Amino acid sequence: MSLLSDLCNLNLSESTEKIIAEYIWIGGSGMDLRSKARTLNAPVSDPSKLPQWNYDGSSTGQAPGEDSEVILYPQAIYKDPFRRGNNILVMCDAYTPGGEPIPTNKRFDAAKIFSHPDVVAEEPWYGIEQEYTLLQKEVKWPIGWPVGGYPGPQGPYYCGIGADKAFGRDIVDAHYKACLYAGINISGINGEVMPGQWEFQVGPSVGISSGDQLWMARYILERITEIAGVVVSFDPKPIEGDWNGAGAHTNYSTKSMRSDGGFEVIKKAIEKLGLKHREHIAAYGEGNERRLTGKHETADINTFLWGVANRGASIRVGRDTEKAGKGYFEDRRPASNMDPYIVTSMIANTTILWKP
Amino acid sequence: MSLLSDLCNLNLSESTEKIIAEYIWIGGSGMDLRSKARTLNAPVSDPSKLPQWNYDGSSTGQAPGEDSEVILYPQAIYKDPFRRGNNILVMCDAYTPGGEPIPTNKRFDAAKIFSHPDVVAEEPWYGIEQEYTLLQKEVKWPIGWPVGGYPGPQGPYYCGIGADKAFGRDIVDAHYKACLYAGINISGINGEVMPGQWEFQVGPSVGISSGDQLWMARYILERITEIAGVVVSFDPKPIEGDWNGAGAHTNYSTKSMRSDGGFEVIKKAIEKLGLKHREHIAAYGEGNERRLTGKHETADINTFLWGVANRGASIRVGRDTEKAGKGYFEDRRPASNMDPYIVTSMIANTTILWKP
Amino acid sequence: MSLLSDLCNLNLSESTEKIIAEYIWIGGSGMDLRSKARTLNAPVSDPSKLPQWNYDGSSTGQAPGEDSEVILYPQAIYKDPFRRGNNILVMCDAYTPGGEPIPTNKRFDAAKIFSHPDVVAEEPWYGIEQEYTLLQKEVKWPIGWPVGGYPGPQGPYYCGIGADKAFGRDIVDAHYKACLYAGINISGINGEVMPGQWEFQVGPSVGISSGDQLWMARYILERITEIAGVVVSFDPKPIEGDWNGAGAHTNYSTKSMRSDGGFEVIKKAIEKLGLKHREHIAAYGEGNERRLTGKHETADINTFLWGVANRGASIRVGRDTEKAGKGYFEDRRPASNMDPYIVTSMIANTTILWKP
Amino acid sequence: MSLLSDLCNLNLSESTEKIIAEYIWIGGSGMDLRSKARTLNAPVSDPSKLPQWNYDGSSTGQAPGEDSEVILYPQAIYKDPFRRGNNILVMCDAYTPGGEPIPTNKRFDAAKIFSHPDVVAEEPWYGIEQEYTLLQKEVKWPIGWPVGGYPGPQGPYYCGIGADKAFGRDIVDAHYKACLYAGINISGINGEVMPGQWEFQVGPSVGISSGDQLWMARYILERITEIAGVVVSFDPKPIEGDWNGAGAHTNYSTKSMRSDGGFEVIKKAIEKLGLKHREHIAAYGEGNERRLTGKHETADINTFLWGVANRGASIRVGRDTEKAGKGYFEDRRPASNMDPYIVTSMIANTTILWKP
Amino acid sequence: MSLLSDLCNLNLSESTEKIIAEYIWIGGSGMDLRSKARTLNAPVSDPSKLPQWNYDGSSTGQAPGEDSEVILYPQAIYKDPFRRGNNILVMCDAYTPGGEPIPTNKRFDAAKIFSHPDVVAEEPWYGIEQEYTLLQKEVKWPIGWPVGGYPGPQGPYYCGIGADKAFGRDIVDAHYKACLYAGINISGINGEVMPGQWEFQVGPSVGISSGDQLWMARYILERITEIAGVVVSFDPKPIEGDWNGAGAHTNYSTKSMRSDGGFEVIKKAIEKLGLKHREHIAAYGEGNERRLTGKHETADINTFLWGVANRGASIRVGRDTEKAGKGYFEDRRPASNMDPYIVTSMIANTTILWKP
């Protein structure tokens, strides 16, 4: 189209020297994201030089009814894909005046854990595999499904090509381009054994940058999906039928594990993480009850078991690590609406800081 | 349109230096193709430097067993038409951990038979004439045909121009441009006697590059018709009533045939191929019995006829070849869903290595 | 639409040196045109340095059922408007193995008669005024025309501007641009009395080349209207009723007539044309029985007339020719589906060779 | 619908005794019909008492320039299916002012022929089998034909049954019941091989009654299909190609042919009919040339063939009729757009008055 | 609408005592029917009193080339549900001119078998159940069937109620009432597991009457669904996949089995049926092998299984029947496209005449 499309893609440095910095903060329910733009004066490149901002804490649902002002802090800056130029995107944190973070921040303790000398001397690496569903505008069925109906049986959809196999690859391709342009270290994408569903894998990020990049990628996906004209649901089981349930896996790797002869280290880490499976399964995301039932390459909710090749194992280890004696292992417990901060912090703490 | 079309065509070489590389492997049923992308780090030009992957063996219906990982070996690299820049497309063949090919690979034997000193001394040339149908998204009739109805009788459609003659020349022209840009040695296109059917002829490739290029061209066509929202079927008889049945032909040549007085060579090779007619029929296509019936310039399923201008002959030789004493002969047996690897290997073996 | 529009418009000179030469030959019924593309290795500029193709002579209906191969010879090369670059369009004439022109060739005798020393010493000039109707895709009424209805009385449409007067000036303007770009020596366009109808004038093309010019212009028009989405019919009476009938006229000129004392020469030529009239009126086109009736500025089938100003005269002379000699005369006998080769050949032959 | 039906079927006899009479006369073309109604004070039963009434002949193209008045002579009385009650349908003949028939009357001569003492003393019987095609309102395709296409080949369409096999049998049933009600001798109905073409047999009414009843049945049919919203065309070849046409089988038999052993009289009658085949065909109606070629169980216009059980013969005699030695025979040559008056009158003239 | 239906339900007997005879005969395929109508002069009740009539067998594809005439023999008189009054539907058998039956008759042999003194002295009754699917008119999916998809898994569809559970039950109910009215012994109806599939039990009629009534019920059903704009296919497996198909259960019981100690007699009859089951399967109908694979409550083609409460056996005997020691048994092996004449006559033959 050409209506309103000339003004949106208008060069910024031609006239003035002003950029705009959209502000992103975690919403009230813990999963929704909110954003509101604000002009700047000079193109900034240091996240510590940005000015703090605020929003109404009683409209979203993060503050009581006596004092709604919620001070925000800027954390990271990423290049704006939807308006290019020198515009930036920032990730912010919700705090109350007086320096106390809101109960629904989840990044204060994450940064506290990851500022420890041990973790900064170990620098763990995390790779997250996110799975999301694309739903229609109104009916709220996945796109491509007939209204009140279902497509053919699953199996000829995984990494499919052509029509009737991939529904809406434009959104995912645009997402890939935008995250490669912004600065997020994305790795690759593929289909999933459910039609409409997809998946993108975030690369080996260090520290809390994993959570930062995952959140920014979720924001980019939501904006691109809004541009297209559909909605995205991150819940673990979008459809209650007999289809794949969305989830997430977390690659784990520290310096000692991938240095030399790390098989014993990964093994001991498996027992360490299995010791406290209770709180870990309780703190990986609401809605995991309908995902982990015993079907569709999933384990059971109240059991812990690990293997080397079985796809039903809650935690598995790549056979390449066994070949070489060093590598990683896959944590297949987290659901598709998890908070990367808490999961990453719990894994790092239970692995490197806990002394039984 | 401008809905996300600006983001898809974004030059990634201006900001970053990384490229992406889609992976293509032969599916489970033998005809389906699957793809999933990844991000490399440097623009590669040697196929031997690429890293290997795997995929879910129990999702494509070729699971070796408990260990579902299916290692993939990159073979050839082609420039990406749908993303331009330094993006590439690669062709991969399936394998199992342990160095053995998957049962539905059919490329291991082809490579091991085309690495023979004799065949590399003779360097056969193959020209493949693939013909496909374009059929609608929903009712599965060919595009242009009325729903539950038929257009005028065949005859005014062959190489037709204008509306009511060519149904979707845009898609085929885009395919031709993309194949010429990628690196495939495509020769030309033309219509066939049916509304919707078409044809593209692949040029004189050498060795297993014939199968590589044919498979990559099929992938490119399928992606393009996915962009256009149309499904493509390669089966020999898309419509069973009266119309022309799709198939394929295989030009063949070696050094002796096109250099010396090779009329005797080509004729004796024709009897050689006629001696092994049984498994050659059995190994050209699933569903070929609906094509070869005795009508529409097709041979029968129980005879082997070769001549000079017999339109129904299973094999014919070029008249310029006979007049000049050197050239090629045309194999009209293969169907439209063939595997180029097996047909190429069988022809080469039966004509240069197999002896009475 | 931005779908598939990026791939179609690509600059192949950026990556390779290959071009695309599309072959055009006169079909079986005499009026249909057929095409199929190929890939030349290097750009060419001499029409005598091209390879010869063939096609299935039994599919079109132009060759017998024994040896369907139909050798084609390239004649002229024109720049491709629909893909630009170094791509070319070639005009080809059919034949049979053995060098014998097909019964429906009609260009062999044209070239033979125009290679005569007298003709090449006289260099006749022909200007052709072709008029065509644009029909809808399905109903087969003209465009901008109610189904089962009529727009209104004629008179406000001739050279009309604005809506309700010109139905599809976009297609004709595109045709004008493409013909000026290709190499055709087109002169001008205008509307015609009945709505939907149009007219373009090919102007002063010397020698046999007039047939090539007009045929390539027809091909360009038909491809352009295929792109638009409507069909075009060249029959003399597209719609039966009280409406203007389509046709054609042929300007004629030779060195003697446009030299000093040319009025006597043109009068002698008109008398000669009147003397040999039966085969002329039987060879100008199939469909004159509905055009030449006696109405709408048209002569009668059973008469021959000449004049300077009468609109119903079968032939006439331009006024400036009468005033100041030189000039030409307009042959108003040919219909709208004529073969230019035979018409120009007989006109030149009757003018310069036959004696009473 | 709910309204415009209560007062369209309202009963008038309950209030008064005024009836409605529709006067029917043939237009100038000779293939369509005209009708207009006139109130009568009291109900009538015999056509003799109905007074004559005039109509404008200028618009019908049957009147001289000065005096444009035409007089009608009521002939037959039939009841009205669209008004019920005592309302009547009456057939009329156009007469010049002065006691002479209109040139396009075609019934005065028939009445003179049939009123001859020998003709009435022979009591002829006539049976006609007319066929028609139901076609749409705008696109002029037959009902059920996919627009811009053709349905399946000949097959389950000749007197077929079921959805997608027989189109619009409700109109045929409506005609059958209405013509049984009105007073028209209808024998039976059955579909035709072309999808959308039907047929109804008119009973063995005697003399001028056969023509009168057939004209009235055609009037009722075209009124019914006007009500339904479908145009009916009785042309012998509504659709040209590989589909059957429409004809009439005028079965002839007088008192002698069904009383004694007329097995040797039927052949004499056939020969008498065939003595003047040329003008006999010429007196049948336009469109006869495109149907009689030999295919679709038809005969040849320029040859006279007679047989026993061959559909290729112009005249055919049933096996039971020839076995019994008495009965009738089938006259297949008359066209479906004939004038029944002329056909029956001239057949009677040939049979009883004309001599070899 | 109100019009075009008032005169489709008129009282023809009000004016004249003419009745309408609907002649019915099987086409050449053996799975569809044909219809023809004619006016009789007086109402009849005895089928033998109805005169013979002929149809053109060339289009039917079951007539000799020289003599296309085919003679019909009325068999059974059933009252009309679409015209009411005294109008009748009659089932007819096609006879060649000469006495010998049509090759595709299947009724003369059945009549000879059933007219044998032993068969009529045993007075068998047959119970036949048939199942069918209600397909759409353009896309060949069932009714209520989400296009481009499938409905929920097999759930509340077997004789279910409510919207979105039972589709198009109005057609089935109208068929039930119409078959009760016409004179066909129909027992009951219920839904089927596949959404849109139904069935109706035909009551225990005698011998040839069972086949005649089944044919007439199929005729009436297809007429009704033609009125409703829905096509009906009695295929053994209309849709391939994880959905149930359609079959035919024949309930056979003669005097001996129904009386006294019939358990041993029915067991002996079952063994007699199983002795030569190969031609039994061969003489039921095409498409049986797709339906008979083992799943969806059926036996295997190559294996003969019998039992009492096992649905996997080709023969099932009710618990009450065996408890009482007398009754019938169910033959699940017939296909949904069977010929009732052949099945009934063959069952009677193998029961009473054919010996081991």
Residue numbers in the entry:
A (entry chain A), B (entry chain G), C (entry chain F), D (entry chain I), E (entry chain B): 1 to 356
Quote the study's own text.
One such an example is glutamine synthetases (GSs) (EC 6.3.1.2), one of the most ancient functioning enzymes in existence and a central enzyme in nitrogen metabolism of all living organisms, catalyzing the formation of glutamine by condensation of glutamate with ammonia using ATP as an energy source. Decades of studies have established a striking notion that all three classes of GS enzymes, despite of dramatic differences in amino acid sequences and protein sizes, share quaternary geometry in dihedral symmetry assembled with two oligomeric rings. Considering that the active sites of GS are located at the clefts formed between two neighboring protomers within the same ring and distal to the ring-ring interface, each isolated GS subcomplex ring holds multiple integral catalytic sites. Cryo-EM structure determination of GS in both the catalytically active and inactive assembly states allows us to reveal an unanticipated self-assembly-induced disorder-order transition paradigm, in which the remote interactions between two subcomplex entities significantly rigidify the otherwise structurally fluctuating active sites, thereby regulating activity.
In contrast, under the same condition the majority fraction (~82%) of CsGSIb adopts a pentameric configuration, along with a minor fraction (~18%) being decameric. To elucidate the detailed mechanism of how the interactions between two GSII pentameric rings remotely trigger enzymatic activity, we next employed single-particle cryo-EM imaging technique and first determined the structures of GmGSβ2 decamer, as well as that of the CsGSIb that adopts decameric configuration (thereafter named as CsGSIbDec). 3D classifications of 104,717 and 43,876 particles for GmGSβ2 and CsGSIbDec, respectively, revealed that both molecules were arranged in D5 symmetry with two pentameric rings stacked in a head-to-head manner, a strikingly conserved structural feature for type II GS species. Refinement of the GmGSβ2 and CsGSIbDec structures yielded maps with an average resolution of 2.9 Å and 3.3 Å, respectively, with literally identical dimensions of 115 Å x 115 Å x 95 Å. The active sites of GmGSβ2, CsGSIbDec are structurally highly similar to each other, as well as to that of the maize GSII, suggesting the catalysis mechanisms of these plant GSIIs are essentially identical. The overall buried inter-ring surfaces for both GmGSβ2 and CsGSIbDec amount to ~2000 Å2, that is approximately only 400 Å2 per individual monomer–monomer interaction. This highlights the weakness of the inter-ring contacts, characteristic of type II GS. Indeed, in both structures the inter-ring contacts are established by only a limited number of hydrophobic and polar interactions provided by the residues 136–141 and 146–152 segments of each of the intervening subunits, which behave as two gear teeth (thereafter named as tooth-1 and tooth-2, respectively) interlocking the two pentameric rings.
